[PDB]
Amino acid sequence: QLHCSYESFDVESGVYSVSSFEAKPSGSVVEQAEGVECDFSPLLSGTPPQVYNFKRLVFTNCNYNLTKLLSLFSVNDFTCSQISPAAIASNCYSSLILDYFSYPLSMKSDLSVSSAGPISQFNYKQSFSNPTCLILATVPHNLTTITKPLKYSYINKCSRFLSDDRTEVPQLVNANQYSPCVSIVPSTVWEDGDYYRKQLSPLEGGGWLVASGSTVAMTEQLQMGFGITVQYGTDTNSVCPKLEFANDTKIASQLGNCVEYSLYGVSGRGVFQNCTAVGVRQQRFVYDAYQNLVG
Amino acid sequence: EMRLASIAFNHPIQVDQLNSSYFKLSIPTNFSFGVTQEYIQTTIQKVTVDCKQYVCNGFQKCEQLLREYGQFCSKINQALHGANLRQDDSVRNLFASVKSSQSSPIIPGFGGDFNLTLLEPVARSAIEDLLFDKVTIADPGYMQGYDDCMQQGPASARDLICAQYVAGYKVLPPLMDVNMEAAYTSSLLGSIAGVGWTAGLSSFAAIPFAQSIFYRLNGVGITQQVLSENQKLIANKFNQALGAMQTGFTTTNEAFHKVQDAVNNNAQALSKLASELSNTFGAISASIGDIIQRLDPPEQDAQIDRLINGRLTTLNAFVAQQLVRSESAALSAQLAKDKVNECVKAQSKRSGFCGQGTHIVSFVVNAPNGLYFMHVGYYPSNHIEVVSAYGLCDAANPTNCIAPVNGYFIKTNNTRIVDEWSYTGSSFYAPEPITSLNTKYVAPQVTYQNISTNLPPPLL
Amino acid sequence: GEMRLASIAFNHPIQVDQLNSSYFKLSIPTNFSFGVTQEYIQTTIQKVTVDCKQYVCNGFQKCEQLLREYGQFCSKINQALHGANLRQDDSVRNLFASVKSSQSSPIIPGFGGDFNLTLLEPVARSAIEDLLFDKVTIADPGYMQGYDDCMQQGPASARDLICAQYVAGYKVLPPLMDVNMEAAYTSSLLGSIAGVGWTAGLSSFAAIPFAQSIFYRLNGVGITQQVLSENQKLIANKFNQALGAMQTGFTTTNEAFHKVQDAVNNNAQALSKLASELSNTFGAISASIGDIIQRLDPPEQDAQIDRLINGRLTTLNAFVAQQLVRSESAALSAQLAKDKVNECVKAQSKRSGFCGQGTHIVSFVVNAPNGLYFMHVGYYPSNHIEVVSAYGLCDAANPTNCIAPVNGYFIKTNNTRIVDEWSYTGSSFYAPEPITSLNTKYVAPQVTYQNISTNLPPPLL
Amino acid sequence: PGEMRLASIAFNHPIQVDQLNSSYFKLSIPTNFSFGVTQEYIQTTIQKVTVDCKQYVCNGFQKCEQLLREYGQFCSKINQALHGANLRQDDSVRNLFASVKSSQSSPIIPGFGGDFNLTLLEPVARSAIEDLLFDKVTIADPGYMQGYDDCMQQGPASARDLICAQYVAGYKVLPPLMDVNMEAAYTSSLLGSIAGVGWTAGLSSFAAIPFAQSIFYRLNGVGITQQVLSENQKLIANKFNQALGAMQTGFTTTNEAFHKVQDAVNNNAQALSKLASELSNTFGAISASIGDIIQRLDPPEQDAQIDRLINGRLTTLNAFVAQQLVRSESAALSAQLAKDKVNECVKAQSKRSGFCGQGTHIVSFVVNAPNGLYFMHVGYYPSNHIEVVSAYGLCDAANPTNCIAPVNGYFIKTNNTRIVDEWSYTGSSFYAPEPITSLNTKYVAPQVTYQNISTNLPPPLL
Amino acid sequence: YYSDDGNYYCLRACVSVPVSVIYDKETKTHATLFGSVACEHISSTMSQYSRSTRSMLKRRDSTYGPLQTPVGCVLGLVNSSLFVEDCKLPLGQSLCALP
């Protein structure tokens, strides 16, 4: 390496530095769980919502096997952003969040995290502060507890008319939130091009709320869409894949080499020692000013 | 409330110029010893950088990505090695002037009545240890090393030296060896007594310290007669100035402040490097392993590439900063060498250099990353004005003209001298009879006084 | 006409042929003139600070939120600039500590007798300092009236970067030194004159006429006292002619003067570089933040703002680094000035090198913007002649009676007033005189000393 | 070879000499000496270069010419900065040489210095020593004349000079301000400025005395007595020549001053070579060549790739200017140091220590070197030190007001069989007793440590 | 390159000629230097070319040949063979350039 560093077959005499030893770390241990098997059973029945009626599940403190969940539907589109599609199943988080709604494959052009479509203008937006994913799927004929809407439908307008009846200002949907027009729009759109208006009070700042929507024909088997996002916390990272710990060795002490670890889904590598306590209790993790875990 | 105030301007004592053959002369009637101090940094701490570990920690995707940039690291390592070599050169060059061909042995009770707290506790010195205790620097490297990182030590360690083994930093040991350094400073004390008795560049006088002091005092125009009368007084005033050094290690002492800032600058450079390990460049995480675990490899290395590039950029900035500091230290080291070969090895007539009180012997001790100088100096006080003449002549014979050597001719104000004129030393008010030892023959001049009666030099 | 190719001239030294044996050719000037040289030593960098919020953006809320992510860069910038300014003020205090004297002469009109002394204050600064300030092209001064000279209550023709200071968020810190106190310090140095002689001068103050201190210095370079007494008015005349040349000294061919002007230019350039960057896009749609806000939907708006902010921060970082380098070079330059005050000014020097090249005789210093301006009086030899000279002389009747000249030479006499075959001369000027005990000392005998068989007064026997 | 050996660093202890009680003391004095030489290299300049700011960036391809207009003001800043740096380098040379020249000098002849060898004399020219230096230097051949026609196809295929690569990069290497022959004449004048050295500061007078005579004057200037010098005159010249002759073996890599010259040469070479490598440095652009990206790209795409290539090229030029400014200033400071050494280490003997060679001071010499000046300092090295008894002074016991003390030497108890007197005088620089006489002493005020002499002193006789 | 005629040929790419000018602001006149290229490649007009015209030189240099110097070939410099200490426009070496 010294010769390569100087590009020569005869290095001048001296004392010179070379790269450091890697220090041979021990095989990994974990502090993940206790918890209870995830409860994704709400997904097994009923009609999924129109895109502005979203149903959401949020999980904490629990253990899961998403591939068993995935086996229940046929997925015709799986993509993700800021995470590999495999790693979202393997990673422990402070929460697991799933949004679900009905969605025809005939409208599939309007759903991406980057879409400019009316689905994203007024019915759904996803934050990029979290690494969520997406799924388009259909229901197998043996899922009889699943039911379907008369038509698939969405809001294609949501704006407020100025009190002088000329100027109008759009109300785009907030990331991870329902648009304000949901208070006047019907649970499904009865006919394509239906629209509604609400006069607004001086307490509301005046003007008229205006909203409208569109519909798509029903299909023999229900089509569905999902939005999935995750949240990384610090001492709240209780959602993980079911443990593989059975048939292994006692954990976590080795003391020992600077062994790789995951504690409640927080990856890292290092050696532990039985030192004294510092405050404060129940925050779990302790850190320095440089964002390095201390203990 | 804070008070607005004018900045004071001290006015010099005014002395009126006078017309004709005589003039007003200002002379001090008291004095005090005093000291000043300086810190001359001579080195930058020497460090090296593992250029693989700073960027990434053996992940295999980054190892392959890093290869496209491998020549930058080679430039980085080479630049750092050259900077460290220059630091070693300055140390050896300094020590070459520090050493002497010969020296006195040193024992307790050296310097007689002078207190000499600087003597080693045979050792370094109590003064050097006070400096080391006042400095707030983190606990030293090398031994025990690795066990101040590792769990076989206190949980309360906060040393950046443990972080040295995370970041891949290496602190090189100083070349000088603190025990050899102490030997070198004692060798300088052994050259004392002394610098006088001609150039001193061959011979070694080997005389008592007090004798060399009296010689230096006579070298600034204090008469020998005064020196013999006040010998105990001189030692007492000298020791008072020396005793003040125990209060000298304070934050208002600017030389002390500079020592602490030299330590702060070395620590600061490393702390900047440590903080950059956590600095994302828009990357999803500062950890390479974390972004690998979360991403498919075609996407994964877009994140890795951004992270690598910013990390390389901070290394480049760091190297440039070190090169600049190394050069300034080399220049500062040359200044220290000059002072050892001027302010310490000899009494000087230049003013300027050394503490501002004429010059009398100065001393130097070890300080972290440098030398700390202390300068004894002479401060005049209680100035009075006297009548003085440019010279004297024989009124009966105009070619008999004299003028004082290393002193002045003043009208006498003393009851023991019958002669109307008296010789004085130039450093202190001390009138005495005019004799051939204190005067020399000179060419005649119109301003010399014409003496018509009693002048002993020449008698006729 | 067409430009002309020419050789660079090489002035040859006057050749003096070496001679063998016990005697030698000696070159001595027969004329001289006073003359001057000047130097400018910069001691400081103008002190400035930067509002790090206003340089980047100007109260728009969106950029303030964006800036918070980078707020620690500004903290680093402000601290670095603050430390740079502290160093500049340290150097001022350290310099002034050597400038001050424990005692000085009062200074009145007509000081220096026959010497003209245009440097005296108009009791004040000095006429010479004011000529320097008038020749300098520097922009009108800050502080008062300041901010209201930016404002519409003034002429439309103002073009000061100082008004632009209140747009850019720049702050120019005032100098520590206070120009009135500074003028007092230069007069204190003039009060230490007359003088440096009569031993080290580090305790006592001689308090003698200026002319007397000049004669002392002239005797200090080997000019005989007898010559000095005969030429006193001539010396004053030549000296005043050299001083009078200072009125033509403020020209562009004077390099010290040129350096003063460029120190001023360098400070102005640092600020103008900064002003131009306010309009520099980094590929942003506009240099104005408010304009891109007005024209853009907010999800796209801060892409443009981000590009703009990062380029603005980068120029501030480069700017600080430039100032740190300049501050360090000024500190070193200030140390040099201090050395000259404690050497070239406070004493006559025998070193050559330092001061103007004409041996050394008294030098002066005056205030200059951002520094000190030195002037050096010097002695220039002319009309050299060659003469016969000997290493020493000794009585031929007694080989131990040997003498050699002190600060001068023994030359064969060419003068009709001296009956003696040999004569003493000063080393700075041709001035033969009788050899007497005052100008000689006894030395050990040497083979090259001349064997004088007749009349020698030192020793008479 | 076997295994490496760990070893302690040796510490050379100073010779110990005891401090002593009462009126007399041990004195350490050398009994032998030798001449020796030390040397220094002081760089004074940076090579002056300029850069065509269009040619470095592009080869005149038209798409670049259109795009470059957006950045034309950067180039002006680059050119101005380099021009000012080069101006400063020329001014420093002129400033230095103004103090180098002497108003008068001895003619230089063969056989100068008598018995001294003087290999520094010109081959009437430069000097043999300067030629040894220039041959040891590894620097590439100069341009100008014939210049370019050594770059052109009518020449060897083996040239690899950065100097002919100058015509590819848009580089210009400016010529040095002075012709080498004038520079040699400036140092010839310095050789002829020796003697006078003594007889006051020498500032205007020219003593014109033989070089050997000036050496003896200098030896009395360091306290060597005249009697010794007259006895050893041939010996002194021989020891001096042995030290001088060693300069022919001094040009090795173990000579650190020589090593600094070698580094100065490669600091200039390194700066130029960096930029040659940057011509091939793509910035992620499709190719580092403009013509390649033109030939492989549709013009809407092509321009984007050109701009990316331009941005990195300008960035390296900016970095280069910053590098040059730093180097130029350090050279100016180094040149100032050289100027002071010419006016102290060379023009006159000095008592300072520190500066010049580490052996007191005796004459030093300076020669031309690439980018700088090279100094040699002759010095005096003491040897074989002995301890002797010495006294602070002597006085008449019968007349206590008669007190004397030695001048440029010390009173010692005599150890010599030719001196009947119990006390003797020796010079500060060397051990060699002599009778105490009025020439070697001065009257002083009485002091209690002076010896009370009850017998015989000739100064005063009574 | 090895040609398919079996002969090695070598390639030096191509070269450019550096140029500099002498500007006398006091008289508002100028002259130029082509450096190391030498006057064997210099002609009254240029076929290469560095700028759209050379005519500013031609205002006086229509009447003069190129002049070789130790630094290089020049236009309009004139051989006056004068000796001057400082021309305020030195060309380096022993060359100088009087106004």
XYZ file of C-alpha atoms in Angstrom, chain B residues 30 36 66 93 112 119 122 153 216-217 339 380 392 403 452:
15
model
C 14.610 54.912 42.710
C 7.280 40.425 31.868
C -14.027 4.975 -3.077
C 16.897 23.128 14.670
C 23.016 32.633 46.825
C 15.398 25.229 40.109
C 15.640 16.780 41.511
C -11.565 2.316 32.692
C 25.140 43.455 34.128
C 24.122 46.287 36.412
C 15.424 35.080 21.358
C 13.244 53.711 36.853
C 34.577 70.503 31.364
C 33.888 64.507 28.974
C 39.726 78.145 36.446
